[PDB]
Write a protein that binds this DNA or RNA. Structure first.
Ligand SMILES: [Mg+2]
Ligand SMILES: [Mg+2]
Ligand SMILES: [Mg+2]
Ligand SMILES: [Mg+2]
Ligand SMILES: [Mg+2]
Ligand SMILES: [Mg+2]
Ligand SMILES: [Mg+2]
Ligand SMILES: [Mg+2]
Ligand SMILES: [Mg+2]
Ligand SMILES: [Mg+2]
Ligand SMILES: [Mg+2]
Ligand SMILES: [Mg+2]
Ligand SMILES: [Mg+2]
Ligand SMILES: [Mg+2]
Ligand SMILES: [Mg+2]
Ligand SMILES: [Mg+2]
Ligand SMILES: [Mg+2]
Ligand SMILES: [Mg+2]
Ligand SMILES: [Mg+2]
Ligand SMILES: [Mg+2]
Ligand SMILES: [Mg+2]
Ligand SMILES: [Mg+2]
Ligand SMILES: [Mg+2]
Ligand SMILES: [Mg+2]
Ligand SMILES: [Mg+2]
Ligand SMILES: [Zn+2]
Lengths: 144, 129, 25, 102, 110
RNA sequence: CUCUAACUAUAAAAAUCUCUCUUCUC
RNA sequence: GGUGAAAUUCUUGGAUUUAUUGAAGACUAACUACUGCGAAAGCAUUUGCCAAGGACGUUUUCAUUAAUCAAGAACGAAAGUUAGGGGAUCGAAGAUGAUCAGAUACCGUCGUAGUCUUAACCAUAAACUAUGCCGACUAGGGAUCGGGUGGUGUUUUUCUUAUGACCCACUCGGCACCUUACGAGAAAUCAAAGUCUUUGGGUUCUGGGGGGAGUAUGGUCGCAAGGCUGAAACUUAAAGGAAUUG
RNA sequence: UUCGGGUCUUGUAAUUGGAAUGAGUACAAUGUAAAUACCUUAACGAGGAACAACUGGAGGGCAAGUCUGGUGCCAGCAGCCG
């Protein structure tokens, strides 16, 4: 009646059919192939430190006209280079050139969020201190 | 090919009930069909059936009275442990107050309540309500 | 675009790449 | 989606038929999707029947006819006015257009 | 021309506007080549060739071509790229040419 | 409650288009 | 000649048409249909031979020998590739004559390869009923093809009958079709796409948003063309189906 | 009869009173191998009871503003639509 076999001794083909079909998913394929460890900028890592290389802003998409103020960071753990986004009104000036910055995920499962092209990472901490504490003047940059 | 004959019998019963008839002609007429319809007679979901000898598998003529609403085989006769009877009743029967999972135990083909009364369980045949 | 002509363009790219490989095989 | 349950072909159980050419545009089209019109007419029209009758030996000539089955394509059939677009509830009808004259 | 015009703002500033000068980073430049994606190349009057984005309020509001004087705002964090902010319609450009805020070696006349 | 007849038959050329889309509760 | 209209082209060495004929190669018109056969491609002049096959009839024979199928295999349209044969038509390339702003496109005239075949490859098609196969049941109406039953039936004519051909009724099998929802669907619609939340007759293959991409790589087949197997990185908020009003 | 006593209650006011109590300190003792710490408890310890609770959000999904000022497809926000 249905495509799958139904006999009491058909466990083998049911199991192997499910096992072969599981590769059609994206989460299962990523988890089993281990693509996150090999190809992603961080291997199964929620956060990662890095060094600021330069200080660039990127224009937004079509329906949204602006320039989001990002920063190019070379990761210290392995040496990869990724653009990351500093999230707030006046936080670009807070981060200076060639300082250690702790990047985090951008919240969209390693994909570009909203209208910002070619970015996948936030900025949470700079030079050991957090952006949010600087933005509300609760702490200040050590300037070392 | 005809693999599960009881499936054909119950499908014919379902089709001839949904259309509003009062009789069915089941062709192959094995032991299991006779016992299944006998249980249905015992519980009232069926009327007055009949075995027609052909010297070749015989046949059955079933009389209905509209009291039944659905038969159905569990085609893979799963080994049903006495603990799994309640799960099958929940998954198949529409309410706990009625319905019967007809299953074949070593003590014969019996409704699930009778099997639970004997404290014996075996393979599952089908369901009626 | 048509799948036919995209297929044909891929075949012509394979033309060039196969000739190049045959030259350097 | 299916515009025609018959697919327009009218084949239903052959897989392949032998194509025929259009009389106007010479389109190699299958013989069943090749809408056919049997033009049977007089070799001399009603405009010259009297003239021919008055000026012909063999009094009461049978005036033989001419027969030709025209195998149109479908683009020509739409354009050369042979066949017309129809309502989707009128596409059901396959009878010829109701006996042009009785 | 077209029926587009009636959908527009009808902002009719035909009379002679007062030209805007350069302020602490905003500088004059000349369109050298037209690129795609709504971006232009501007030779600034400092010996540099900056890449200037066709910018908001300017994208599909004024139409600009090769060899047009322009006012463009820089970005202190990235000097190479910049944003076109205002366009001068070839009349006040002559005035700036006489006043010479830009080197006069860039002679662009019809 | 009784029937099977009439018929035709034109194809010149015609590419392109920019903003900007905005709440429905007794 | 030909065309919307022209021109290229052939022609008083008499073309275009006109009568007999002859040569070559291809094709099998009209009959030709909601008709037939086949596993699918596909199959249409006559006759003979060769073997094969479905359907029906059967108070014949064996008694589960069966259904679907990874591995393996046979055929597999057109196009294309090696050689040998032919070489009519039509016609990729090409040659031009037109149309245009351009036209090495569509209209036209020539025109190789090919089309047609004997061997050897190729294994892909919108190879479509975009509906896997086997099995059961469920609803009314006619027709149609093959077979078989009965008619106190009708013309047939060989005096009567036997056939055959019809007419009426029934049945089996097949390509199909009309109506309808009382069932199913997102609907278009389907008599199966029904008997599925009242979810299980057996069984094989395939899909998990779009693009990248049926791409690269690695195998494997192929002389070659290419076939089979076949991702990811990355990017994207949609792409898509049916139908309603403009 | 307009009332209106508020006849019977429930909130809002930088008005205003009397209480209770720890979070902290700390005689002790208990605790512990010895000490912290906890349980108990002297003596202190609340008026703005400054002994002061933040973290996010207020278009929709999704509870809560179409209030005020600022910026004007900038700055920025926005997991998605925006
Ligand atoms: Mg910009
Ligand atoms: Mg369409
Ligand atoms: Mg048709
Ligand atoms: Mg067939
Ligand atoms: Mg106006
Ligand atoms: Mg002659
Ligand atoms: Mg013939
Ligand atoms: Mg036939
Ligand atoms: Mg296989
Ligand atoms: Mg060939
Ligand atoms: Mg040859
Ligand atoms: Mg050409
Ligand atoms: Mg030309
Ligand atoms: Mg041509
Ligand atoms: Mg020719
Ligand atoms: Mg294919
Ligand atoms: Mg297919
Ligand atoms: Mg996908
Ligand atoms: Mg694809
Ligand atoms: Mg390869
Ligand atoms: Mg659509
Ligand atoms: Mg707050
Ligand atoms: Mg906020
Ligand atoms: Mg706010
Ligand atoms: Mg709300
Ligand atoms: Zn045509």
């Amino acid at each position: 009646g249905k495509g799958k076999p139904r006999g009491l001794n058909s466990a083998r083909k049911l199991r192997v059919h499910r096992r072969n079909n599981r590769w059609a998913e994206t989460t299962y394929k990523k988890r089993l192939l281990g693509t996150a460890f090999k190809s992603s900028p961080f291997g199964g890592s929620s956060h990662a430190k890095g060094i600021v290389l330069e200080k660039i802003g990127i224009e937004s998409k079509q329906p949204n006209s602006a320039i989001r103020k990002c920063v190019r960071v070379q990761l210290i753990k392995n040496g990869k280079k990724v653009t990351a986004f500093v999230p707030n009104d006046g936080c670009l000036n807070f981060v200076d050139e060639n300082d250690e910055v702790l990047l985090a995920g951008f919240g969209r499962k390693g994909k570009a969020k909203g209208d910002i092209p070619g970015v996948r990472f936030k900025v949470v901490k700079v030079s050991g201190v957090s952006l949010l504490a600087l933005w509300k003047e609760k702490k200040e940059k050590p300037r070392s | 090919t005809r693999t599960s004959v009881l499936a054909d019998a119950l499908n014919a019963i379902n089709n001839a009930e949904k259309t509003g008839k009062r009789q069915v002609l089941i062709r192959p007429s094995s032991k299991v069909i006779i016992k299944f319809l006998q249980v249905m007679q015992k519980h009232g979901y069926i009327g007055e059936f009949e075995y027609i000898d052909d010297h070749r598998s015989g046949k059955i003529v079933v009389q209905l009275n509209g009291r039944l609403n659905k038969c159905g085989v569990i085609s893979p006769r799963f080994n049903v442990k006495i603990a799994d009877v309640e799960k099958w009743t929940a998954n198949l029967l529409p309410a706990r107050q009625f319905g019967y999972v007809i299953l074949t135990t070593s003590a014969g083909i019996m409704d699930h309540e009778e099997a639970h009364r004997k404290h014996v369980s075996g393979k599952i045949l089908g369901f009626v309500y | 675009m048509r799948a036919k002509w995209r297929k044909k363009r891929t075949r012509r790219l394979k033309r060039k790449r196969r000739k190049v490989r045959a030259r350097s095989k | 989606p299916k515009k025609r349950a018959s697919n327009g072909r009218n084949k239903k159980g052959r897989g392949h038929v032998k194509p025929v050419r259009c009389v106007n545009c010479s389109r190699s089209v299958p013989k069943d999707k090749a809408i056919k019109r049997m033009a049977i007419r007089n070799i001399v029209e009603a405009a010259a029947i009297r003239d021919l009758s008055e000026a012909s030996v063999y009094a009461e000539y049978a005036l033989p006819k001419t027969y030709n089955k025209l195998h149109y394509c479908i683009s020509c059939a739409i354009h050369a006015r042979i066949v017309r677009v129809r309502s989707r509830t009128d596409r059901r009808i396959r009878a010829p257009p109701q006996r042009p004259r009785f | 021309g077209g029926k587009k015009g009636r959908r527009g703002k009808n902002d009719s500033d035909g009379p002679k506007r007062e030209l805007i000068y350069k302020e602490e980073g905003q500088e004059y430049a000349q369109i050298t080549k037209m690129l795609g994606n709504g971006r232009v190349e501007a030779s600034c009057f400092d010996g540099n060739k900056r890449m200037a984005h066709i910018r908001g309020k300017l994208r599909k509001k004024v139409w600009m071509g090769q060899g047009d004087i322009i006012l463009v705002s820089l970005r202190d964090f990235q000097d190479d790229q910049c944003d076109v902010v205002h366009k001068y319609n070839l009349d006040e450009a002559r005035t700036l040419k006489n006043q010479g805020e830009l080197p006069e070696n860039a002679k662009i006349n019809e």
